Amino acid sequence: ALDSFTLIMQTYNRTDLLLRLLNHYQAVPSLHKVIVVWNNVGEKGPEELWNSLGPHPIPVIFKPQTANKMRNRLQVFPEVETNAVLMVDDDTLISAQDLVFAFSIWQQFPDQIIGFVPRKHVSTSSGIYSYGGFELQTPGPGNGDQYSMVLIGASFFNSKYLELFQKQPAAVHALIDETQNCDDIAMNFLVTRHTGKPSGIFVKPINMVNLEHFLQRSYCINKLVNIYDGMPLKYSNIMISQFGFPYANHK
Amino acid sequence: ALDSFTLIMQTYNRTDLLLRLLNHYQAVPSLHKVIVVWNNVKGPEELWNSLGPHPIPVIFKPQTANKMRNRLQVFPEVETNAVLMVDDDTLISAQDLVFAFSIWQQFPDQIIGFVPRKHVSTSSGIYSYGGFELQTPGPGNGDQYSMVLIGASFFNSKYLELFQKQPAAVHALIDETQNCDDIAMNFLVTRHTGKPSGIFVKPINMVNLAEHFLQRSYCINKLVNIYDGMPLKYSNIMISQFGFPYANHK
């Protein structure tokens, strides 16, 4: 458990999907345990089915949820024993190769969000911020582009941040529930304020496949700026790839 | 001097070439000053000055072929925390330098460079020097590098002072073997930080307008004997600039 991570996955109305993903993820090296946030209330959990198709490499804990909230996966689950958490949306398939590499990167930067989906905030009028990706002009006056966030939906991060998230101003808790989204934007804020460093590091995926309420995202950023009284997100243009994978990719 | 770096370069009979490269490097942002070590026998200085003015001070220092064998010298003229070292047969785009320097600023205790290399061992205690033509020593897939050469690299000037403090056996070894200061530097840096001696930054535009592989294999083993241990740590981290080239993230 000291050299592994816990996969936390939230699902709703995607069962045949969930099981397919699980078949994949259960086999990834260094995976210590899986927690399946069962968001389909008043519905029979797929746990009986999962067990019927056993044995499985690791324990899988299915957890029925009170309501159908987004920040539910951001809860502090007592069954998480690892220092690293791997959060993946129930519609995303990330290769073992990518996970093994990204986890090894997270181990060297334990206090940052190591992930495959980078995003950023921009400003063209003082004090007002907007949410976007590479379709938006870069902030810095220099070359390339910048990112100030790494979405948690496909990332590795310290489990302590989930506990830290619970201690955030209620104002933030409201916002999350009010928009039924924006969690990762709140997490990126949290992490960067805690570390004084860019909230995350972008690890370019070699094989990630998908089987955002942009406007609300922007809205959330400005709201959050009030709450935290400022914009703490730090830009970064660091993109990490695995040396020699694919072969000769260094030249 | 704050947030700036000093370029230390060596030139071997190539005035035309030297001034060409110098015309290039003088205009790289954040460059505070240049130091040119050249083999004596008339200097390039007068010619360089005659074609002034220039953005930064360039200091010419005459040296015998002997001393020049040693690139790990301490020049009192260096006033910056970081040093950029480049062979006089290499043109590194300003874009690579500007980006590489910004990475060095975040990892000032590591060698941020463009040429990765590694050591391998197929028999306990016996190492060999090489590049990607050799099998990865590491865990699973991909490859590994345990060194980043100082030529085409940014690194802390303090390491030059720290080198001077290494055991006499290291100094003697370096003076006996041709190059090998590279090996010494990488050994020195990792021992001091407990981390990979360097981080490989993939160059976008670097051009070469000699690595004594066997001798470097020899030095690694010699240095393993001298330090009584192999400190080189493997890393498979390759850094590239987000968005440069455009959409390179996908």
Query: Domains in chain B, ordered, with CATH?
Result: 1-250 (3.90.550.10)
* CA–CA separation, A161 and A183 (whole Å): 12
Contacts of B174 (CB under 8 A, 6+ apart): B70, B72, B180, B181, B184
The neighbour count for residue A81, using CB atoms within 10 Å, is 13
* CA–CA separation, A238 and B123 (whole Å): 37
- DSSP per residue, B123-184: ETTEEEEE-TTSPP-SSSSS--BSEE-STTEEEETHHHHHHHTS-HHHHHHHHHSSS-HHHH
Of B95, B140, B200, the CB nearest to A143: B95
Q: How far is A47 from chain B (nearest CA, A)?
A: 33
Q: How far is it between the farthest Cα atoms of chain B?
A: 58
CA distances from B124 to B58, B120, B127, B128, B143 (A): 48, 10, 8, 11, 20
* CA–CA separation, A202 and A158 (whole Å): 16
Residues of B in contact with A237 (CB under 8 A): 99, 102, 241-244
Q: How far is it between the farthest Cα atoms of chain A?
A: 58
Q: Is the peptide bond before B76 cis (omega within 30 degrees of 0)?
A: no
- DSSP per residue, B79-136: -SSEEEEEETT-EE-HHHHHHHHHHHHHSTTSEEES-EEEEEEEETTEEEEE-TTSPP
Q: What are phi and psi of B211, to 5 degrees?
A: -85, 120
Amino acid at A47: E
In this structure, what DSSP letter does residue B228 have? T
Of B132, B242, B244, the CB nearest to A202: B242
- CA angle, corner A215, sides to A211 and A220, nearest 5? 105
Positive or negative: CA dihedral B67, B68, B72, B78: positive
Asked if A58 and A24 count as a contact pair (C-beta separation under 8 A), the reply is no
Locate A139 and state its tokens. Answer: 């902030």
CA-only gyration radius of chain B, Å: 18
CA distances from B68 to A159, A166, A184 (A): 53, 61, 54
The neighbour count for residue B237, using CB atoms within 10 Å, is 21
CA distances from A145 to A151, A169, B147, B180 (A): 17, 32, 29, 38
Q: Which of the residues B99, B242, B248 would you substitute to probe the A interface, choosing the one with the greatest number of A C-beta atoms within 10 Å?
A: B242
Method: X-ray
**Nearest-10 crossing angle of helices A183-195, A214-227:** 40
Asked if A110 and A5 count as a contact pair (C-beta separation under 8 A), the reply is no
Taking an 8 Å cut-off on Cβ atoms, the answer to whether A238 and B103 are in contact is: yes
Pairing of strands B111-113, B198-201: parallel
* CA–CA separation, A242 and B95 (whole Å): 22
* CA–CA separation, B207 and B197 (whole Å): 24
* CA–CA separation, B13 and B34 (whole Å): 18
Positive or negative: CA dihedral A209, A211, A215, A221: negative
Pairing of strands A92-94, A208-210: antiparallel
* Residues constituting chain A: 251
Residues of A in contact with B96 (CB under 8 A): none
* CA–CA separation, A5 and B212 (whole Å): 43
Locate A140 and state its tokens. Answer: 């810095």
Query: Token pair 């303090």 is at which residue?
Result: B158
Asked if B83 and B189 count as a contact pair (C-beta separation under 8 A), the reply is no
* CA–CA separation, B182 and B104 (whole Å): 18
Contacts of B111 (CB under 8 A, 6+ apart): B148, B150, B153, B154, B155, B185, B186, B189, B197, B198, B199
* Three-state helix/strand/coil letters over A115-173: ECCEEEEEEEECCEEEEECCCCCCCCCCCCCCECEECCCEEEEECHHHHHHHCCCHHHH
Nearest to B241 by CA among B96, B92, B84, B90: B96
* CA–CA separation, B181 and B169 (whole Å): 13
Q: How far is A238 from chain B (nearest CA, A)?
A: 6
Task: Report the C-alpha dihedral over residues A64, A70, A75, A77, rounded to 10 degrees.
Answer: 30
- CA angle, corner A126, sides to A138 and A143, nearest 5? 15
Contacts of A85 (CB under 8 A, 6+ apart): A5, A6, A7, A8, A156, A157, A158, A159, A162
Catalytic residues of B: 182
* CA–CA separation, B3 and B101 (whole Å): 9
B101 inside 8 A of chain A by CB: no
Contacts of A174 (CB under 8 A, 6+ apart): none
Q: In B, residues 127-156, which contact A (CB 8 Å cutoff)?
A: 132, 136, 140-145
Asked if A48 and A17 count as a contact pair (C-beta separation under 8 A), the reply is no
Q: How far is B98 from chain A (nearest CA, A)?
A: 9
* CA–CA separation, B52 and B44 (whole Å): 13
* CA–CA separation, A35 and A172 (whole Å): 25
B215 inside 8 A of chain A by CB: no
Locate A25 and state its tokens. Answer: 């993820």
A196 conformational bin, left if phi > 0, alpha if psi -120 to 50, beta if neither:
left
Asked if A103 and A30 count as a contact pair (C-beta separation under 8 A), the reply is yes
CA-only gyration radius of chain A, Å: 18
Resolution given for this structure, in angstroms: 2.4
Pairing of strands B206-207, B116-123: unpaired
Residues of A in contact with B95 (CB under 8 A): 143
B248 inside 8 A of chain A by CB: yes
- DSSP per residue, B200-212: EE--SSEE-----
Residue of B nearest to A146 (CA): B242
* Three-state helix/strand/coil letters over chain A: CCCCEEEEEEECCCHHHHHHHHHHHCCCCCEEEEEEEECCCCCCCCHHHHHHCCCCCCCEEEEECCCCCCCCCCCCCCCCCCCEEEEECCCEEECHHHHHHHHHHHHHCCCCEEECCEEEEEEEECCEEEEECCCCCCCCCCCCCCECEECCCEEEEECHHHHHHHCCCHHHHHHHHHHCCCHHHHHHHHHHHHHCCCCEEEECCCCEEECCCHHHHHHHHHHHHHHCCCCCCCCECEEEEECCCCCCCCC
The neighbour count for residue B207, using CB atoms within 10 Å, is 10
In this structure, what DSSP letter does residue B77 have? T
* CA–CA separation, A66 and A54 (whole Å): 28
CA distances from A172 to A48, A182, B53, B82 (A): 37, 10, 57, 42
A42 conformational bin, left if phi > 0, alpha if psi -120 to 50, beta if neither:
left
Nearest to B113 by CA among B79, B156, B172: B156
Locate A15 and state its tokens. Answer: 């069962």
Judge whether B166 is annotated as a binding position.
no
Element (H, E) at B214: helix B213-227
Three-state secondary structure call for residue B40 = coil
Element (H, E) at B47: helix B45-50
Q: What are phi and psi of A241, to 5 degrees?
A: -130, 160
Element (H, E) at B59: strand B58-63
Terminus-to-terminus CA distance in chain B, angstroms? 38
